[PDB]
Design a protein around this ligand. Structure first.
Ligand SMILES: *[C@@H]1O[C@H](CO)[C@@H](O[C@@H]2O[C@H](CO)[C@@H](O[C@@H]3O[C@H](CO)[C@@H](O)[C@H](O)[C@@H]3O)[C@H](O)[C@H]2NC(C)=O)[C@H](O)[C@H]1NC(C)=O
Ligand SMILES: *[C@@H]1O[C@H](CO)[C@@H](O)[C@H](O)[C@H]1NC(C)=O
Ligand SMILES: *[C@@H]1O[C@H](CO)[C@@H](O)[C@H](O)[C@H]1NC(C)=O
Ligand SMILES: *[C@@H]1O[C@H](CO)[C@@H](O)[C@H](O)[C@H]1NC(C)=O
Ligand SMILES: *[C@@H]1O[C@H](CO)[C@@H](O)[C@H](O)[C@H]1NC(C)=O
Ligand SMILES: [Cl-]
Ligand SMILES: [Zn+2]
Lengths: 174, 597
């Protein structure tokens, strides 16, 4: 029911600081999304039937980064921002949002993590903004070998499709 | 961790910080070339300078990761690139003044005008007007004036600056652990630390010269033939056994013999393969041109263009009020944004160009997966090689039939084929000794082998002996003709023009063979062979990630450069030239002069 609140929402978060919305009891039918070429991914990792009757994760990533919201899966986004368990699963949906999340001029609102001492456990979250040093040291930039672990995506309207912004909504089943 | 694992992280910050910072510059630069404007010009600079300053900063930063401590080929490469000291390695004002030289040279060249020795109110610039004389006029004297004026009014101006140029540049070069500035340029072809596929800065010089020797017979004969035709157009000015007067060669320097086609056409009754007036016949436009080249590639299993290519490109001059620089360039911007800026006119030549530029785009799209710093042609010569390879195929009488431009019922007799080959030889074959000689002079001048007081003495010695071309007026060290050529006075390695020529043919002979093509190699069109696609694309996706020897070896089957394909293409010209030369003299004397009399 409160799906319009979820992926119809004006404001979507960064990947690293993703949001989780708790949905229980509410009666859904799924047809709200089932029949629509509004979406660009819609690949499930569990089922795809309808039994009238749950967690919703929202965030924005680059075109080429959608691949990474799946069991297994490569790096950066999957490694430091949003990890999905090898087993246990539900469904993943995505849509191109160039129209909203890109200014011709550049939209650097959205961030993501590229550096962390250690990969994430699934469904874990890291909101920590500490200057990173590959030897676990304290760090006082712009000193050499100091890095801020967060990178601005930078969404220009004109880039390749793989570089345009996509909103993502992960539906987990419990 | 290992300073390697460290350097990896440094590079990983760089790639993201640059990919963006470039895209910004890119985009401003784009805004400008399509819309020249005070607002758009200023902007182009700001973004461009945050850029070069970011590069300088990251260069000085990588300068802290010791190359002699990395065992990963890939990252060593990226670092090597980044930690080029360049012009920084000089004193505060040594680098300053150098930039002062490099700047005015560029200017006085582009700004230099020349006026009539009788009518001081008509003053010509090199572009157009002056190079227009040098490309069209058949009036011996008028040409001689245009040739000499340039080299006298502007050569002599560039002389003192080029003098100091060589010093400060050789200083920079030696301070970077090179032998001379020349050695610094051959460095582009260098590959160390990859058993078997290596290539030393010197291995070029010998390779170039070795390959250049096999050109001689072909060149010598081209020479003899045009030498003869020329005599007819300039009666009593040319010795049937001497060099060609520098000013009769159809462009300003004689880099290209293209324009002597009027004067030298083998069978001038036979007309021109030209479908421009038959593209207009089927009311074709810009988009049809590009959609068609797009077909051409999708046909060999490369991908379509991007939606953002069709959305963001500019294929037509947008009339007046908004004025844009029309030079056919293909843009790789960053962030999967690829586009072309071309003022497309419904013409064969523009049609072909469209294939050539869209061929750069493809290469760009290919090596895009690559990390930022590895996104380039294997060497300085790969990109353009690929550019031409698309023109080559798209121009064959065969392709034109299928594309429904050339009429099905048109036959192709063995005389039209000769005309076309000669057209080519004028351009492709003419410029090879020119280029080689040109570069040889520089190399040596940089190696300290040519003393200041014999700079124009050895220049013209070498022109006479290698290129087979004589100065119509003698020049002392007051002149500086080598630097009367954009590339030389604007600080530019010129040999890439030699090696690019040679690859383009090696690429084609390979591509054509894999496309299973039957006849003479110049009738080959790779259309429709996904096989030719695959092999090309195999080198194409690498960028600079591997050594240019492998990238070559990925398509051609060898680790080195080879002139034989280039010859094989001109085989039926060569044989046909020898006959025309039957009762002509092949070779020349370096002693004859058109003035010493
Ligand atoms: C030399 O340096 C580069 C550092 O980039 C190394 O290539 C990179 O290293 C890892 C190998 O652990 C690659 O990870 C692999 O990615 C693929 C992606 O689909 C995945 O299938 C593999 O299971 C693995 O995760 C990574 O892709 C690659 N990075 C780049 C830039 O492509 C290379 O390994 C180094 N040489 C050695 C052997 O020390
Ligand atoms: C948002 O919700 C409404 C139903 O209240 C629906 O009409 C619309 O299709 C939804 N849009 C999206 C983006 O799912
Ligand atoms: C071109 O010029 C106009 C000025 O009339 C300017 O407003 C506009 O931004 C420019 N267009 C482009 C391509 O940016
Ligand atoms: C390839 O070219 C031929 C003629 O050259 C054309 O008839 C054929 O359909 C083309 N096919 C493709 C897929 O490009
Ligand atoms: C190439 O582009 C056009 C766009 O309309 C399309 O019809 C065609 O199928 C494309 N080919 C490929 C590679 O899918
Ligand atoms: Cl000259
Ligand atoms: Zn080009």
């Amino acid at each position: 029911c409160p799906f319009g609140e979820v992926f119809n929402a004006t404001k979507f978060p960064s990947v690293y600081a993703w949001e989780r919305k708790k949905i229980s009891n509410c009666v859904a039918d799924y047809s709200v999304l089932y029949n629509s070429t509004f979406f660009s991914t819609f690949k499930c990792y569990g089922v795809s039937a309808t039994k009238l009757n749950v967690y919703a994760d929202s965030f924005v990533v680059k075109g080429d980064d959608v691949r990474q919201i799946a069991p297994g899966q490569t790096g950066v986004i999957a490694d430091y921002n949003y990890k999905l368990p090898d087993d246990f699963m539900g469904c993943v949906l995505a849509w191109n949002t160039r129209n909203i999340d890109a200014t011709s001029t550049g939209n650097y609102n959205y961030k993501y993590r590229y550096l962390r001492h250690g990969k994430l456990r699934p469904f874990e979250r890291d909101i920590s903004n500490v200057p990173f040093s590959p030897d676990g040291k304290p760090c006082t930039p712009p000193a050499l070998n100091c890095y801020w672990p967060l990178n601005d995506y930078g969404f220009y309207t004109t880039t390749g499709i793989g570089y345009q912004p996509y909103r993502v909504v992960v539906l987990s089943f419990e | 961790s290992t300073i390697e694992e460290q350097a990896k992280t440094f590079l990983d910050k760089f790639n993201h910080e640059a990919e963006d910072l470039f895209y910004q510059s890119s985009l401003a630069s784009w805004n400008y070339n399509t819309n020249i404007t005070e607002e758009n010009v200023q902007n182009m600079n700001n973004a461009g300078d945050k850029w070069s300053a970011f590069l300088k900063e990251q260069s000085t930063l990588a300068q802290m990761y010791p190359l002699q401590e990395i065992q990963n080929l890939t990252v060593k490469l990226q670092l090597q690139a980044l930690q080029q000291n360049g012009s920084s390695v000089l004193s505060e004002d040594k680098s300053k003044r150098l930039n002062t030289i490099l700047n005015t040279m560029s200017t006085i060249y582009s700004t230099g005008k020349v006026c009539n020795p009788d009518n001081p109110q008509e003053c010509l610039l090199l572009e157009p007007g002056l190079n227009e004389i040098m490309a069209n006029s058949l009036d011996y004297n008028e040409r001689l004036w245009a040739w000499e004026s340039w080299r006298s009014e502007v050569g002599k101006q560039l002389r003192p600056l080029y003098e100091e140029y060589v010093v400060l540049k050789n200083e920079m070069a030696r301070a970077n652990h090179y032998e001379d500035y020349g050695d610094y340029w051959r460095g582009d072809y260098e590959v160390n630390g990859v058993d078997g596929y290596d290539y030393s800065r010197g291995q070029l010089i010998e390779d170039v010269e070795h390959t250049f020797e096999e050109i001689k017979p072909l060149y010598e004969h081209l020479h003899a033939y045009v030498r003869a035709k020329l005599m007819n157009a300039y009666p009593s000015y040319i010795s049937p056994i001497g060099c060609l007067p520098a000013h009769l060669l159809g462009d300003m320097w004689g880099r290209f013999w293209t324009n002597l086609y009027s004067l030298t056409v083998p069978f001038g009754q036979k007309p021109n393969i030209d479908v421009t007036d038959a593209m207009v016949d089927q009311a074709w436009d810009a988009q049809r041109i590009f959609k068609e080249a797009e077909k051409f590639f999708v046909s060999v299993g490369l991908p379509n263009m991007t939606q953002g290519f069709w959305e963001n490109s500019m294929l037509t001059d947008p009339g007046n009020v908004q004025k844009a620089v029309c030079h056919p360039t293909a843009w790789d911007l960053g962030k999967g944004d690829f586009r072309i800026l071309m003022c497309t006119k419904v013409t064969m030549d523009d049609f072909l160009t469209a294939h050539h530029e869209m061929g750069h785009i493809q290469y760009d799209m290919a090596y895009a997966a690559q990390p930022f710093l590895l996104r380039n042609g294997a060497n300085e010569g790969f990109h353009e090689a690929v550019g031409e390879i698309m023109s080559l195929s798209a121009a064959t009488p065969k392709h034109l039939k299928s594309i429904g431009l050339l009429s099905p019922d048109f036959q192709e007799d063995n005389e039209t084929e000769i005309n076309f080959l000669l057209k080519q030889a004028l351009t492709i074959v003419g410029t090879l000794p020119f280029t080689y000689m040109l570069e040889k002079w520089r190399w040596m001048v940089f190696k300290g082998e040519i003393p200041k007081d014999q700079w124009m003495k050895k220049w013209w010695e070498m022109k006479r002996e290698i290129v087979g071309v004589v100065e119509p007026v003698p020049h002392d060290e007051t002149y500086c003709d080598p630097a009367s050529l954009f590339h030389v006075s604007n600080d530019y390695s010129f040999i890439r023009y030699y090696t690019r020529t040679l690859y383009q043919f090696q690429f084609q002979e390979a591509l054509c063979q894999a496309a299973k093509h039957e006849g003479p190699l110049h009738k080959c069109d790779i259309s429709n062979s996904t096989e030719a696609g695959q092999k090309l694309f195999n080198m194409l996706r690498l960028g600079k990630s591997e050594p240019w020897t492998l990238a070559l070896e990925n398509v051609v089957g060898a680790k080195n450069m080879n002139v034989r394909p280039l010859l094989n293409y001109f085989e039926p010209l060569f044989t046909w030239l020898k006959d025309q030369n039957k009762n002509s003299f092949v070779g020349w004397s370096t002693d004859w002069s058109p003035y010493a009399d």
